[PDB]
Symmetry: D2
Subunit: 231 residues, 4 copies
């Protein structure tokens, strides 16, 4: 199977796989069962901001998710990514729906990696219909209002159930190296999760993977397009 | 055929295809016969710096090539790259040898493109044996002393004749867009051209191409790995 | 007197001092009588964007001023800033009103200078009530809605006549050096010029000055807070 | 008294004020008696690199000090800088000598601060004789070989005892804000500490201070130009 490290914005509690009983953010290391979670007051129809940070000094993967004029949710987990990921990775955004659904709209995405110095930075403040520096997988589309729709939306703007989609940056990223004095990365994205129902599902993740990562077959719903099973 | 825009550091005068009778820098628009050239005092065995700049306001492609404690060579050409290149491109470094030879050693390479904002930046201050964000074509290799050798060198660094090699950044670049108020790019690389002979050949280019560009058949020597013919 | 280089967004034609008979953008080199101007379709009450660029290779000062979904205005002038400005400068925004008036509201301001490398970058996407990295001169205030008001506005945002104000970045900038292979700078700001009258005045400038520059006595109205006289 | 947060590269053990019995790096919060230290294998006459990082999510101040082809020294301390520093600060480099001495040569210095976004970045890869974006205090000088000499060196290159000097970046920095979702800073500098004696003293610090900070009178030797006493 693929190797996944992810920050999940989990809109739907699957208590049977160790989700807490509320919308949450989590750090996932090679399992959909988050190593750590924090409560997340998701705001249906409001534009949110996610910031993810890691450096090779602290070896702490941290995420902050916020909306204007509201308290942030934050989660951190000590992990040595050198012992989990291959040296070269791709970075991406993933989303899913199941029997419940939501828009998984990305309005912007930036990423910076630095290895001491080699550097990579990309910034998307808009997505075009033919975004050739993105690998779109499953139901992911670009161009509609200059946004990235990770999961399927009908002609009338309604989100579809049992959908899964991902966008990976085209270039592989050197995420760690033994010869590195300091390695760091950050990602930011803005998202709009809307549900006609007051039961939205299933969420959005920022993930890092083996370069050849693809949607595991059947990874709709609670598996967020990341994992083949709930182990 | 490919679509090429390039800045050439041409170490060998091919007077039969319109080269001036001295080492020169040139701006190449879809031809190896430079639209504009300037005299270049190439310094055998010394580390040089090349800077290339363009913005959609001035629509002027400019390059400066320099060595420490020596006068710069500079060349500029008015061109609307919107009318020459496709919207999506790859960016690269190319080098060749022929009957005469030289090391085509790259010690560092950076690039920034901005479309008003979407942005791409990479910086290589060292190259690793397995540099997965580079597409190596022909004789180009990485890892030897942390450098990028565009053309063939022996175990002792001695350069071989009839060699051609290129390195393209893995991700496609959005170099222009009609809805853009301002588009800009800049590139820097440091190079070491050494020749045992007092007749070095054939040179190094920074180039921008169609995303699927490859070394044209036969394009060793004066064609610099860029062009199928001398038209 | 001070040494000024500026890009003016001139909302009010002073035909008696060589303004063309319409709102215009201009390049000012040590005089309010622009060395070059272009027609500017200023849009009362709409947020606009100004981009200013210069590099030591082309030695061309260029500016583009635009509104969403409208054609740009652009102006360029060939000037060797090495022969005009001192080596060390301050960078700033200036605005004035006279008998006629307008809001001179700055919503954002960024600047980058590079000398080949020494570098300086600042980005203001909001201004606080106590913005200690800004020198406010004359009527300029910060904090109201997180904006920079260069000229006087009432409690309800209504603009006052005979006002002049400037904001300079606190740190001096090394804009040129003889030992530099390449020097470049860029500035971006977003502005909101609103007038209850259909005769707005007098405009906004981005300027570069001697480090100790201050508002010349009397420099309200057509002198834009930049010049002691109309010579 | 001033408010100081610093990372010290302490070359001289003052066992009487709680220094460990070896050259060390430390995190100083309003005292020269480091809240945390790590062993540092200082290499007389070799160019070293120091990296300092902090973000408002982890609230961890970390430093890594390294030489090429040697193991790094690293130190971290959990501190909420929001509870220690004023909102606006200056950032600087400090060094001292006492009865024992050393060159306190800075070859380069970069700093980035970001408040979510407002940003500040400066990079010095060389210092000029008249570096107007630096406030030099005490014995600090610029221009000699393009370096920053924090403490006094004689005409013959010999370091002098009982010397103290600092360089602060001219612009105040917004290092924290209550409305900030994420605040971060990083600093990098390269240094050359040479001693003829083989008993070097006293060290170099990166520090953050109240904007009006100045060398405490008598703060030569073990006080590193930062503190008035050893409390
Ligand atoms: C009720 O179960 C289904 O729907 C939910 C909500 O979408 C998913 O989490 C889950 O994997 C299933 O597809
Ligand atoms: C004279 O013949 C060769 O001359 C140089 C030497 O490298 C090349 O430019 C050219 O294409 C030929 O191969
Ligand atoms: C009569 O003109 C006055 O008003 C205009 C525009 O306000 C200014 O340009 C001018 O200097 C005077 O102050
Ligand atoms: C021996 O004591 C003196 O010299 C050393 C190092 O120079 C300092 O630490 C100390 O403060 C005194 O000035
Ligand atoms: Ca879930
Ligand atoms: Ca040639
Ligand atoms: Ca006017
Ligand atoms: Ca000590
Ligand atoms: Mn979960
Ligand atoms: Mn040529
Ligand atoms: Mn005018
Ligand atoms: Mn100590």
């Amino acid at each position: 199977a693929d190797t996944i490290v992810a920050v999940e914005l989990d809109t739907y509690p699957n208590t049977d796989i160790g989700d807490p009983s509320y919308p949450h953010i989590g750090i996932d290391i090679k399992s959909v069962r988050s190593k750590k979670t924090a409560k997340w007051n998701m705001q249906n129809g409001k534009v949110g901001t996610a910031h993810i940070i890691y450096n090779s000094v602290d070896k702490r993967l941290s995420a902050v998710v916020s909306y204007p004029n509201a308290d942030s949710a934050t989660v951190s987990y000590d992990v040595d990514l050198d012992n989990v990921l291959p040296e070269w990775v791709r970075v991406g955004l993933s989303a899913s729906t199941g029997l419940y659904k939501e828009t998984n709209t990305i309005l912007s995405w930036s990423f910076t990696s630095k290895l001491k110095t080699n550097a990579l930075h990309f910034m998307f403040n808009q997505f075009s219909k033919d975004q050739k520096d993105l690998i779109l997988q499953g139901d992911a589309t670009t161009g509609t209002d200059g946004n990235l729709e990770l999961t399927r939306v009908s002609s009338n703007g309604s989100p579809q159930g049992s959908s899964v989609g991902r966008a990976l940056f085209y270039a592989p990223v050197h995420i760690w190296e033994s010869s590195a004095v300091v390695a760091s990365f950050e990602a930011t994205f803005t998202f709009l999760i809307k549900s006609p129902d007051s039961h939205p599902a299933d969420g959005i993740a920022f993930f890092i993977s083996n370069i050849d990562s693809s949607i595991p077959s059947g990874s709709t719903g609670r598996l967020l397009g990341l994992f083949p099973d709930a182990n």
